[PDB]
Amino acid sequence: SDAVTIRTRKVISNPLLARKQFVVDVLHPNRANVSKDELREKLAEVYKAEKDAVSVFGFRTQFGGGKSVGFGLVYNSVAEAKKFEPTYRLVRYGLAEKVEKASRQQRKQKKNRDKKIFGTGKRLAKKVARRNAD
Amino acid sequence: ARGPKKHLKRLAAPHHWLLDKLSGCYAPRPSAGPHKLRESLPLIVFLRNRLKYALNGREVKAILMQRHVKVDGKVRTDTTYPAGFMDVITLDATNENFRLVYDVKGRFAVHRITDEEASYKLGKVKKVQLGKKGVPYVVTHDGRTIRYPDPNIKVNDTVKIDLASGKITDFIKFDAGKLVYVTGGRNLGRIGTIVHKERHDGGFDLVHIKDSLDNTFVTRLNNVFVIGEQGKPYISLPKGKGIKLSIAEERDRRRAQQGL
Amino acid sequence: MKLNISYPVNGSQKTFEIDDEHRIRVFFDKRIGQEVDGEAVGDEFKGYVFKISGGNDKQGFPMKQGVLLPTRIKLLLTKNVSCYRPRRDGERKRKSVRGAIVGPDLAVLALVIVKKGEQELEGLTDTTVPKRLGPKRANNIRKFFGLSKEDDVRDFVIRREVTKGEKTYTKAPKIQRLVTPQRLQRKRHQRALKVRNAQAQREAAAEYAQLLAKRLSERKAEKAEI
RNA sequence: GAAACUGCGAAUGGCUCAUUAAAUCAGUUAUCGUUUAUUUGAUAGUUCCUUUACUACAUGGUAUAACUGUGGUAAUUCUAG
RNA sequence: UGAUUCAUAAUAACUUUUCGAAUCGCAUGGCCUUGUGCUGGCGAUGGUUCAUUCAAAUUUCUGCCCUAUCAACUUUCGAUGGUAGGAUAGUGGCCUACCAUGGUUUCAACGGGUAACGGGGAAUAAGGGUUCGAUUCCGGAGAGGGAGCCUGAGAAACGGCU
Ligand SMILES: [Mg+2]
Ligand SMILES: [Mg+2]
Ligand SMILES: [Mg+2]
Ligand SMILES: [Mg+2]
Ligand SMILES: [Mg+2]
Ligand SMILES: [Mg+2]
Ligand SMILES: [Mg+2]
Ligand SMILES: [Mg+2]
Ligand SMILES: [Mg+2]
Ligand SMILES: [Mg+2]
Ligand SMILES: [Mg+2]
Ligand SMILES: [Mg+2]
Ligand SMILES: [Mg+2]
Ligand SMILES: [Mg+2]
Ligand SMILES: [Mg+2]
Ligand SMILES: [Mg+2]
Ligand SMILES: [Mg+2]
Ligand SMILES: [Mg+2]
Ligand SMILES: [Mg+2]
Ligand SMILES: [Mg+2]
Ligand SMILES: [Mg+2]
């Protein structure tokens, strides 16, 4: 009753990356910026794939409202979506857990600290421990 | 200074790649290869920008490392491999073959050819010379050394290379009255027949080329590529056939085609 | 000073802090690689023959082998020399090394026992340190165990058992330079490639010579008519 | 799969405009005056010292890192036996 | 090829004799004296030479601000040229040896200043001009000042060394 009426323009079939890539035009009057969950569900039901093989990104809604334009991908399988899709956007869709690393500064500082050790550092640690014991 | 350069600035790229001014400071510097840097088209520019098959360069890498693309029958997994003029690009998935030929605006066109035409290419003879152990070789415009050529093959001729066994199937001489594909300059992409070749011993032999609409133009012989006889080209010509309509006739075509 | 004494035939080594410098003027003004007798060094090293193999002075600078000169100098050290490890390709560093002449400014000598004495030292001779790795190359295994030219080195590999409490397994290195059917296939492929490459080049040369003879006969026919 | 050996890269990028007035630089040439990793294409049946003295090719050798172990210096991306 | 002592081939030798695969992965087919015999596929990495590509180095012609209160400059100690060598990756006074006495200049040489890196360009726009351009692109130069070198295809490198 709210007339989301999603349509897909500029459809290109890509067997090279095993997907269909298109421009998602969302005409949503009396509604603001529908979601990507609704867009992935309602593109899954029209391209018959699954929810987790459909990927959407873009959606700059037009000035004055009532229309959002984006880009969309519908992969041939969930495994082929997880192979070819960026890890950030898999994290967006919940297909991948976010990797918990250190930050950029501590990663580079750890690298430059480890540049000062030649070898594994077991002998260095034993010598430093024994000499600093006396 | 100090060594070979490895970065190509955007705005220092060739203009026919049609890269947008914004979205990054750098352009894809082509690898070393068969074609010169400013007269070639890298695979990232062909796949991401012309065919729109990839959105990123990361996806161009993801396409090429599955050994999908192949240029001249060999796979070429490099992201910035210099696919230049006459090059046949086969995408085995999507079942299509492209020939990198210029459009008449001076740009590499998306030109789909058949699988029969994808089995060969054409090559402009750059030198005919005698190699070691007295063996004659011929060098084409894409760096191919082909041993034991026909003795009638001279410089500026065009050979037909078979792309599976890289031999000369046949060849076309450089005579008056044969088709030309102009591969350089402001007349780049134009197709016409040789009126005559003006000699100039000492440098820069000129060619007077006349197209199908009887418009003559003069081009240096570095930019002339013979593609066949009067009519009946050995390759399939792109859409437009190298005619160079003026801008008034171009807007006349656009208003006569968009009004239905 | 300390004496870093190593007895290499058992691989064992330890340090003796020798004070009371009457015992260590036997070392003084003697270079590296020179042999000394251990009676003047001590009663415990009686009959032993040490060879001075190196040492570190006070402030830790190493004894560079064969300089001269019991003081320190700064040498421009290169690759494949002692007392320097280059951090780049072709990098030389002006480092200060200490000379080969033993003086009183040494903190530790390095000595190798080249002749076992009368009594048995408590940390050098009674204990044997095993070598960490057995041989890995095929003919090195063959000359390690003295077998033959033709024998299966696979059955003579030193294996080591690794125990993680619940699980015990054995690991053997690899046989580098092992004569395998894969290596024979590769050799055969290279020979066949050379043979058929030469055959195809001769066939192309013969076909081109036939073409040249045909064109020469045609040119002679079209010239003799004139 | 840490380490370490090997390979490749570190000569690109980035910054700055101090020098510099036919010098740099611009357009235009020349290499029949040269070097060129990489890429791409082509390319190697001849290996016997003085053949009528061949020594494995079902495949030669040692010598080192990492590692073990013993250390020196207050200190270094120091290193010694 | 506009042009050669070019490409290339041949002859006599020469060489602290260069290269001519003792390398790795995957697949394990085919044949008959069934020996783990003979063959054999798709690649990876190497490798000599030529060509190509990325270049580099040098180079022809013409073009630069102010200054004569800068009219002669260069040539000791290479300045212009010849011959020969050395050196270079290679041309060349690049350097050396021996000769010749040249070379630039009122069409502004040489010197001095530049609060001068050069250019694409920028501001102002009747037209012509005037002024700016350290600065996002191209080329140069430099890493506190000079000099010297190692490794490497490429550096006189400076997040390389002396
Ligand atoms: Mg730079
Ligand atoms: Mg590149
Ligand atoms: Mg091996
Ligand atoms: Mg290395
Ligand atoms: Mg590389
Ligand atoms: Mg000479
Ligand atoms: Mg000379
Ligand atoms: Mg002289
Ligand atoms: Mg200045
Ligand atoms: Mg006015
Ligand atoms: Mg300027
Ligand atoms: Mg500027
Ligand atoms: Mg300034
Ligand atoms: Mg710059
Ligand atoms: Mg510099
Ligand atoms: Mg400073
Ligand atoms: Mg400095
Ligand atoms: Mg390198
Ligand atoms: Mg420097
Ligand atoms: Mg710095
Ligand atoms: Mg730098």
C175 within 8 A of C135, measured Cβ to Cβ:
no
How many C-beta atoms lie closer than 10 Å to residue C28's C-beta? 13
How many C-beta atoms lie closer than 10 Å to residue B43's C-beta? 26
B77 within 8 A of B61, measured Cβ to Cβ:
no
C141 within 8 A of C156, measured Cβ to Cβ:
yes
Q: What angle do CA C67, C68, C74 make, to 5 degrees?
A: 50
Q: How far apart (Å, rounded) are the C-alpha atoms in residues C55 and C74? A: 17
Chain B residues 139-168 within an 8 A CB cutoff of chain C: 147-148, 150-151
Cross-strand partners of B224 = B182
Q: How far apart (Å, rounded) are the C-alpha atoms in residues B25 and B10? A: 6
Cross-strand partners of B180 = B192, B226
For residue B63, list chain A residues with Cβ-Cβ distance below 8 A. 16-17
Q: Which residue type sits at B57?
A: G
Query: What sign does the CA torsion over C102, C104, C109, C114 have?
Result: positive
Q: How far apart (Å, rounded) are the C-alpha atoms in residues C111 and C14? A: 10
* Alpha carbon B81 to chain centroid, angstroms: 14
**DSSP per position, chain A:** -----EEEEEEEEETTTTEEEEEEEE--TT-S---HHHHHHHHHHHH-S-STTEEEEEEEEPTTSS-EEEEEEEESSHHHHHHHS-HHHHHHHTSSPPP----HHHHHHHHHHHTT--S-SHHHHHHHHHHHT-
Grouping H, G, I as helix, E, B as strand and the rest as coil, residue C14 is strand
**DSSP per position, B23-45:** S-SEE-PPPSSSS-GGGEEEHHI
Please tell me the number of Cα atoms within 13 Å of C86 on its side-chain side. Answer: 12
Task: Choose among B182, B128, B187: nearest CA to B155.
Answer: B128
Token code pair at residue C70: 């019991």
Tokens 């006739």 belong to: B249
Q: What angle do CA B82, B85, B89 make, to 5 degrees?
A: 70
Q: How far apart (Å, rounded) are the C-alpha atoms in residues A74 and A39? A: 12
For residue B66, list chain A residues with Cβ-Cβ distance below 8 A. 16
Q: How far apart (Å, rounded) are the C-alpha atoms in residues B9 and B26? A: 4
Domain ranges in chain A? 1-134
The protein residue nearest nucleotide E140, judged by CA to C1', is: B1
B125 within 8 A of B173, measured Cβ to Cβ:
no
Token code pair at residue C69: 């000169």
C-alpha distances out from residue C144 to A32, C140, C155, C156, Å: 81, 6, 13, 10
C-alpha distances out from residue A128 to A100, A115, A116, Å: 32, 18, 14
Can you give B234-260 as a three-state secondary structure string? CCCCCCCCCCCCCHHHHHHHHHHHHCC
DSSP B74: B
Q: How far apart (Å, rounded) are the C-alpha atoms in residues A44 and A76? A: 11
Long-range contacts of B112-116 (CB under 8 A, 24+ apart): B113/B88, B113/B235, B113/B236, B114/B236
C-alpha distances out from residue C93 to A51, B180, C55, C63, Å: 63, 64, 21, 17
Q: How far apart (Å, rounded) are the C-alpha atoms in residues B157 and B171? A: 7
| Contact with chain B for residue C204, Cβ under 8 A | yes
C175 within 8 A of C153, measured Cβ to Cβ:
yes
Q: How far apart (Å, rounded) are the C-alpha atoms in residues C152 and C195? A: 33
DSSP B221: G
Task: Choose among C105, C94, C36, C29: nearest CA to C68.
Answer: C29
Which nucleotide has the shortest C1'-to-CA distance from B4? E55
Cβ neighbors of C180 (< 8 A, separation 6 or more) are none
Which nucleotide has the shortest C1'-to-CA distance from A121? D3
Rg over alpha carbons for chain B, rounded to the nearest Å, is 19
Token code pair at residue A94: 């919940």
Question: How was this model experimentally determined?
Answer: cryo-EM
Q: In angstroms, what separates the C-alpha of B134 from chain C's closest C-alpha? A: 10
Cβ neighbors of C63 (< 8 A, separation 6 or more) are C32, C54, C55, C56, C57, C97, C98, C99, C100, C102, C106, C110
Task: Choose among B4, B84, B99: nearest CA to B38.
Answer: B84
B184 within 8 A of B39, measured Cβ to Cβ:
yes
Q: How far apart (Å, rounded) are the C-alpha atoms in residues A27 and B53? A: 27
Counting DSSP H helices and E strands in chain C, the numbers are 2, 9
Q: What angle do CA C37, C42, C47 make, to 5 degrees?
A: 40
Cβ neighbors of B44 (< 8 A, separation 6 or more) are B28, B54, B57, B60, B79, B80
Long-range contacts of C7-13 (CB under 8 A, 24+ apart): C7/C112, C7/C113, C7/C116, C7/C121, C7/C124, C7/C125, C8/C112, C8/C113, C10/C124, C10/C125, C10/C127, C10/C128, C10/C129, C11/C128, C11/C129, C11/C130, C11/C131, C12/C123, C12/C124, C12/C125, C12/C127, C12/C128, C12/C129, C13/C124
Q: How far apart (Å, rounded) are the C-alpha atoms in residues B147 and B217? A: 35
Query: What sign does the CA torsion over B100, B106, B109, B114 have?
Result: negative
Q: CA end-to-end span of chain B, whole Å?
A: 57
User: Which residues is chain B interrupted after (C–N above 2.5 Å)?
Assistant: none
B59 within 8 A of A17, measured Cβ to Cβ:
yes
Cross-strand partners of A70 = A24
Token code pair at residue B259: 């009004």
Which nucleotide has the shortest C1'-to-CA distance from C64? D80
Cβ neighbors of C66 (< 8 A, separation 6 or more) are C31, C32, C100
Task: Choose among C14, C19, C35, C13: nearest CA to C102.
Answer: C35
Distance B5 CA to E6 C1' (A): 33
Q: How far apart (Å, rounded) are the C-alpha atoms in residues B18 and B11? A: 10
Can you give B131-169 as a three-state secondary structure string? CHHHCEEEECCCCCEEECCCCCCCCCCEEEECCCCCCEE
How many C-beta atoms lie closer than 10 Å to residue A40's C-beta? 20
Q: Which residue type sits at A84?
A: F
Q: How far apart (Å, rounded) are the C-alpha atoms in residues B116 and C57? A: 81
Rg over alpha carbons for chain A, rounded to the nearest Å, is 24
Work out the burial of residue B110: count CB atoms within 10 Å of its CB; fewer than 13 is exposed, 13-18 middle, 19 or more buried: middle
Reported resolution, Å = 3.0
Helix, strand, coil shares, percent, chain B, to 5: 15, 30, 55
Task: Choose among A15, A23, A6: nearest CA to A75.
Answer: A15
Q: How far apart (Å, rounded) are the C-alpha atoms in residues B15 and B6? A: 19
* Alpha carbon B19 to chain centroid, angstroms: 19
Query: What sign does the CA torsion over B92, B94, B97, B99 have?
Result: negative
Cα of B179 from ligand 19 centre, angstroms? 57
The protein residue nearest nucleotide D59, judged by CA to C1', is: C179
Which one of B133, B138, B148 would you mutate to disrupt binding with C, by most C Cβ within 10 Å of its Cβ? B148
Q: In angstroms, what separates the C-alpha of A23 from chain B's closest C-alpha? A: 13
Cα of B94 from ligand 7 centre, angstroms? 64
Grouping H, G, I as helix, E, B as strand and the rest as coil, residue B173 is coil
Cross-strand partners of B161 = B121, B168
Query: What sign does the CA torsion over C33, C37, C40, C45 have?
Result: positive
Task: Name every residue in B having a CB less than 8 A away from some CB of A.
Answer: 47, 52-55, 58-59, 62-63, 66, 68, 91, 93-94
* Alpha carbon B149 to chain centroid, angstroms: 22
Q: How far apart (Å, rounded) are the C-alpha atoms in residues C132 and C143? A: 18
C55 within 8 A of C106, measured Cβ to Cβ:
yes
Task: Choose among B128, B130, B30, B136: nearest CA to B87.
Answer: B30
